[PDB]
Symmetry: C3
């Protein structure tokens, strides 16, 4: 069994000197290789990709001059006046405000915003909380001014909720403010970190997608203008703007590159329903005790929230990824074999000559695929007991019968026609009768009736001379000298005495007939001799005791 | 060499008409195809997936009525009173508070919380910072009330740290508050963006996992109740709640779909140790100068922080992903071949007939695999110098010797038994002696002693008649006419003169014996002639000058 | 066609008893298997990986004692005095501050920071906004102190912008503060959630990478010291520090593990340009009305922003991932076949014996690959009309001509030399003349001139005796008895009358010569008979009417 370990199996192959097939093979191989390499390079499937972790630090610069009114009030706003302490992934710049000073808890008329003007105390509801007004209704319609009256609410008073944002925006100058963004990223798996500002960078730059695509200083109005948004209009009610920072980073030494790409995107819907809080604002309150009364000053601050969104991946060569990709793509290199074998097996079909070629004679030279097919494939048949082969001297083909004989004579049974194999020319280049019978020599079978129909076969389908009348039958089958010579060839020291030699000669005659007619040993093994030939052989080599056994299943 | 380019190699194959094998093959092919397709469709391995980038904007609605006590104090809380300006990925709603007004830097008794009541100045430590009390101890135990005394600390005074949160929570009405969540997402690789609110959506809706699973307006109490949490109890000390927004988005036109799925999850541990800050609170201070004294008002605000967590992927068809998947799965289509070849090579074994079949005769019909194996495999042996083949007329098999001869005669040397090949019946269907010897005809070798044992072989293992006594030996081996005919067949214009013709006839006789006995040319090449036959041949075709060279290694 | 369904094709293979090839095959198989398994286990390519979603809750503990100056002012700072309400992914600890109390809108001298000292009103610019000073210049150079004068600005006054941060930092004690971090993560795809604090954990612990690598309580100074950063110096101007929490989590039951790894990283550049806002600070304003004047108190707060960065993946077994990996790696198991077949086809080359072996005789035993190659490959040639084979009795090889004959005689045409196939020894082990001619027997062709050169071939290249003079030619080719015997073998009941039998005998003689000389039937089919032999055959079997057709293309 140890030799069973030291075995190598290699496939048998046939080789063709064909220009067409070799050319097609190499073309397909090159195509597969080119696509595989292109995909590998384009998608960098040799790399392991890791997402980044980011930190953002922002700084806003700018002073706004605000002139508002009775009297002309001039003032300015600095960063502490329009920005919040947060300086990370988001920052807020106030662009407009409404302020209510000295609020007190008490009853006051609800502000007459859209559809808040009541006509009778029936319209008002006692105890009902109005989230819009931010107070509790007392169910009384009371005057708000000379020509309007509204529901009385308990709230911080005076209540200006629902008041329209001032137009134009008070902090319009914010269009001209600048923000510096510092972005630190890291790929912890690859142990790589970098930042968006490097030594030698200019500090007086201002971002431009063309001239200065790497300056991290942005004018807000320019941010809006780059994407077709009007800062002046958004400043009235506010909005949300995104600054996207994309890092497509290659961390391989021979191709190292990691720099940010900046882009902008509005994040609030422009056509938001008035009931879904259009824009962006928040209310900030300060609380103080004055005159023994606890009071509140509220500012409703409209502005733009800038969301800084940082995303990306870092790639570095990984051998396991490349190995997996190559394995995934290796099987595509059998395309040439699949296609050319398909061509060979398709043009080897007979129908491709009888029908296709007459219509199109350009494909006539493609008949050589029959030769390739016969040199490539060896068809064989499952050797099961009902398998039988018969040959008729009148006909040139062989007939295969692969069904049980339900009493019907094998002569009458139909069968699948198959070609007669060609005998090797090298080896050849040497020196009252039964109704089913018509050769005048067959005899009734001598087996049990259950299996008598097997031996009820003749040498031909039509009346004529028996095959055994030929001298070849006696030369090959009944020539005792030839059979003894064959047996001696197999058993040099054979003893020619007894009935055993007679049986051996009878079997050799059966084999000789079967090999002469069916040629192939696979067919010869399952062949069936005609009754005439069988009984002639048996008469030439009689069996003293017992009746003849007949054909036996080799398996 | 150019013709070497234009070559196509195709594998030689044998074909079997078998119902069982074809059925198994197609079943396995269909199984592999079905699993591959199912996996591709289920996991959408034809798609490239990209993670989303998100922006969240929240708005809380609701007014709380608070009645607290000496006197009955009625007041209300609006959004500016219980929410912070931040409206992004997280928002905070105050549900309870403790307020300390008019704090001053001075010495005060430490608040008598759990285990903070001292009995003597020894318990207190001078200069020690207590993070719980948030002051510096002076090492003196001083009275706090009539019946308790605590360590004196320098801190903002009066100090109420450690005071229990009021129960029930003052802002319980917050259960009935609502929040509107607006979520904007983008897949920048796929250049796709959408939002969680679309035109035509109802505004008076309230979220429900069944009735309104797409309304982005949520009642906080409902959020808690959906996951078995009690808002009333959490409101006392606070907590953290997660609102998860999942985007499983398909961006293919024929299957386009991108909508959010909402879900809730508590993020703070319910059974947190009292020493690990259970709940959620923060302390907010306002500073003011009154009476020339700089004072502080501190509010300890308990509440629920809502964390909005947005995650998901967007898939779109990619040809390279599909190609990689198909390549990864192509090799699974050789399963049918592997399994059926395994069956053929396993049932071709001899042991599978001698032992297995008697126990189970259902497997008797599976002996046909021997035929398939012999039609599929051609075993060959490495042709190395020690390779030899011998045949004995008494025995029916061949004996292979593959070891060096250490003086021992080849007759005595043991060998591996191998079958005698079958001669093509088509070609056959034609017209004082040494101790190791027992045929009475062998002679001692005439080589040098170092290699004499090679030629010390007989024609049989047991006493009997020599093979050469048969007429076949003279007909085939010693028939000068036959050998001349063979030589002329190979060399039509051969000259029959000199000793060269004698040598050629001797070699042809050796070849004829080797082909007759061993049949196969692979075995014939490495065969060894018996001494009797060899010396008989040499006598029939004597060599005038020199001793005979003997067997030569073909390689 | 139904039988076409029930077919199984298996490859024909040859088997070699070789120790070297089997050993190499098993070594390569084991190598491929070992690498595949190692990669699968190391990279856990059987797992589907999901990114986590995180929530962070922080709590800072500590009290700072600050003694600052005229008079000695002693005070303390608690969490509400140096922390902001936010307690999520980032938190801020104030380490230094500059405070400006009682600011008013009015004109004031610009603070004399680096290069802000003007000498004349020309240096100042009217109406220019200075983001550094945060005011509007009036274009007047006015005194700031006794020995310096600066540009007058309208701003919040007094303006201290540009003033140096105090050194040493006032809140140095913050080195000794602690922060507790609570981190909740979830893998929603795998439906797994955990947290960084579990029951039974010690509460008095403090983080250490060696002793306490799992305590989520961190001293800030220790955070800095672990990565070689000086808290004392960073406290003056501030900075940003990252606390990274990595979750490498395996969610398989047999290998379950999910715990955090903590690490630190400075996120602000240490060598930042003074014009790019080095450090970290923000300005916070409180607004109040005093004496009827609206005033502002501004604090410029320097400190450390701590960014808590949480990242990681969770893996769980997926069958589809494993199936894809196995399919991707299956094709690597053909390496043994590729390599050994390459060896066989490379050492089967002739040049590898004539040249390589003499230089290196260690490779002499590798000549056995010629036997393997001839037992493995069957070369065949495309059967196209110009294909011809010729043989010359003087020469021992065959000559293939694969080009059109442009009138030149086939005798003169050159051709590709090919070996003569070996005849099966088993079958063999039996009983005025044209200028191009030199055998004295050839005759001019009798075809049309367009195709006469095909038949203008002789039996030899050099003068000598004709092949047909041999008795073998008459025995094999002209033996009428042998040809009739062959025809009867193929057609047992053949009728020997008419000219049809003569034509059959002529064709059989052509076939016999072609098989005798070219041996292979593939070459015999396209062989060309010499004129001498052809005309001798035709004379022996004359054609009564019509001229002889000649060679015909089989396809
Ligand atoms: Cl969004 C935001 C961010 C940061 C701070 C604030 N707050 N909070 N309280 N006040 C402000 N800003 C200042 C201010 C706002 C409106 C009206 C008057 C006013 O005072 C003056 C007086 C003179 C010149 C300039 N401003 C806000 Cl609302
Ligand atoms: Cl968490 C948070 C978010 C947003 C704001 C605050 N702040 N900061 N300072 N005050 C508040 N809210 C108001 C307030 C809280 C407690 C007690 C009294 C009180 O005032 C009144 C008086 C009458 C009616 C209602 N409230 C906080 Cl603590
Ligand atoms: Cl960053 C930040 C976070 C949180 C709060 C604040 N604010 N905002 N306003 N004041 C503070 N802190 C308090 C304070 C800061 C500087 C000087 C004096 C001072 O008051 C006293 C008085 C006695 C003892 C201690 N402090 C800031 Cl600046
Ligand atoms: N192929 C084939 N073999 C046959 C046929 N008849 C007999 N045999 C073989 O010949 C043997 C039986 O010969 P037979 O003389 O009838 O048996 P006997 O009773 O021992 O004399 C069996 O092994 C059969 O395989 C036949 O028609 N075709
Ligand atoms: N297979 C085989 N070949 C043999 C044997 N003896 C001789 N030969 C072959 O015959 C040739 C030598 O014949 P021999 O008459 O001894 O050589 P001589 O000295 O030239 O006459 C060699 O090429 C051998 O391959 C044998 O026993 N077996
Ligand atoms: N291979 C080969 N075949 C030949 C040659 N000459 C004739 N044939 C074959 O012999 C047949 C023609 O024989 P021929 O006597 O000339 O034809 P006829 O006119 O019917 O008598 C054709 O089918 C040819 O394939 C030859 O030189 N080589
Ligand atoms: C922005 O700056 C330009 C140039 O100084 C000025 O013309 C423009 O009016 C400014 N915009 C606003 C809104 O003040
Ligand atoms: C931008 O908005 C402002 C305010 O409504 C308006 O005056 C101005 O014309 C707008 N500009 C454009 C280009 O729409
Ligand atoms: C919530 O609203 C319902 C219906 O108005 C009311 O019955 C309930 O008391 C409210 N909850 C609280 C805590 O006020
Ligand atoms: C919820 O908590 C409150 C406060 O402790 C309690 O009164 C109420 O019974 C609780 N409800 C449930 C269902 O546990
Ligand atoms: C930190 O604490 C240690 C031990 O109490 C003390 O020696 C050191 O001075 C403290 N650091 C500062 C900056 O106060
Ligand atoms: C840390 O910084 C402080 C402030 O500059 C300095 O006094 C101290 O020597 C520094 N320590 C080290 C180790 O550099
Ligand atoms: Na594969
Ligand atoms: Zn008959
Ligand atoms: Zn008959
Ligand atoms: Zn002997
Ligand atoms: Zn003998
Ligand atoms: Zn000639
Ligand atoms: Zn000739």
């Amino acid at each position: 069994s140890w030799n069973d370990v030291f075995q190598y199996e290699t496939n048998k192959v046939t080789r063709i000197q064909s220009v067409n097939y070799g050319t097609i093979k190499w073309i397909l191989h090159m195509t597969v290789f080119s696509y595989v390499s292109f995909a590998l390079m384009s998608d960098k499937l040799y790399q392991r990709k890791e997402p980044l972790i980011s930190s953002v630090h922002t700084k806003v610069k700018g002073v706004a001059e605000v002139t508002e009114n009775t009297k002309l009030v001039h003032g300015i706003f600095d960063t502490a006046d329009y920005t919040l302490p947060l300086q990370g992934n988001s920052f807020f710049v106030m662009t407009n405000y409404l302020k209510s000073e000295g609020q007190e808890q008490k009853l006051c008329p609800e502000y007459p915003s859209r559809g808040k003007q009541c006509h009778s105390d029936q319209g008002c509801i006692k105890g009902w909380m109005d989230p819009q007004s931010k107070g509790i209704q007392t169910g009384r319609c009371i005057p708000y001014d000379q020509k309007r009256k509204t529901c009385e609410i308990f709230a911080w008073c005076p209540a200006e909720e629902g008041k329209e944002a001032p137009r134009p925006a008070l902090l319009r100058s914010a269009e001209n403010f600048t923000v510096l963004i510092k972005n630190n990223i890291d790929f912890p798996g690859h142990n790589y970190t970098t930042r968006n500002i490097l030594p030698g960078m200019n500090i007086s730059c201002t971002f431009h997608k063309t001239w200065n695509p790497q300056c991290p200083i942005f004018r807000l109005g320019d941010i809006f203008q780059e994407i077709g948004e009007n800062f002046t209009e958004v400043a009235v009610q506010g909005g949300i703007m995104g600054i996207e920072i994309y890092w497509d980073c290659n961390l391989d030494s021979w191709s190292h590159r990691c720099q940010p790409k900046y882009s902008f995107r509005r994040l609030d819907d422009k056509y938001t329903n008035e009931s879904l809080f259009p824009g962006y604002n928040f209310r900030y309150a300060k609380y103080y005790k004055e005159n023994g009364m606890e009071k509140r000053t509220l500012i409703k601050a409209f502005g733009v929230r800038f969301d800084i969104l940082v995303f990306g991946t870092g790639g570095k060569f990984d051998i396991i990824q490349l190995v997996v990709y190559i394995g995934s793509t290796l099987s595509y290199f059998g395309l040439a074999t699949v296609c050319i074998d398909l061509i060979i097996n398709t043009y080897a079909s007979t129908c491709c000559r009888s029908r296709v070629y007459p219509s199109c004679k350009c494909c006539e030279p493609c008949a050589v695929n029959e030769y390739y097919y016969r040199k490539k494939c060896e068809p064989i048949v499952e050797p099961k007991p009902t398998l039988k082969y018969v040959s008729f001297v009148d006909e040139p083909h062989i007939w295969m019968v692969d069904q049980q004989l339900l009493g019907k004579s094998l002569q009458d049974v139909k069968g699948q026609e198959v070609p007669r194999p060609q005998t090797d020319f090298l080896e050849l280049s040497r020196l009252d009768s039964p109704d089913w019978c018509q050769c005048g020599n067959c005899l009734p079978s001598q087996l049990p009736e259950n299996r008598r129909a097997l031996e009820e076969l003749c040498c031909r389908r039509k009346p004529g001379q028996c095959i055994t009348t030929s001298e070849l039958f006696s030369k090959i089958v009944l020539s005792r000298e030839a059979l003894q010579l064959l047996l001696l060839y197999q058993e040099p020291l054979l003893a020619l005495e007894g009935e055993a030699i007679n049986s051996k000669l009878r079997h050799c005659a059966y084999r000789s007939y079967a090999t002469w007619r069916f040629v192939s040993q696979d067919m010869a093994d399952f062949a069936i001799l005609p009754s005439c030939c069988r009984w002639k052989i048996r008469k030439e080599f009689p069996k003293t005791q017992g009746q003849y056994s007949g054909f036996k299943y080799p398996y």
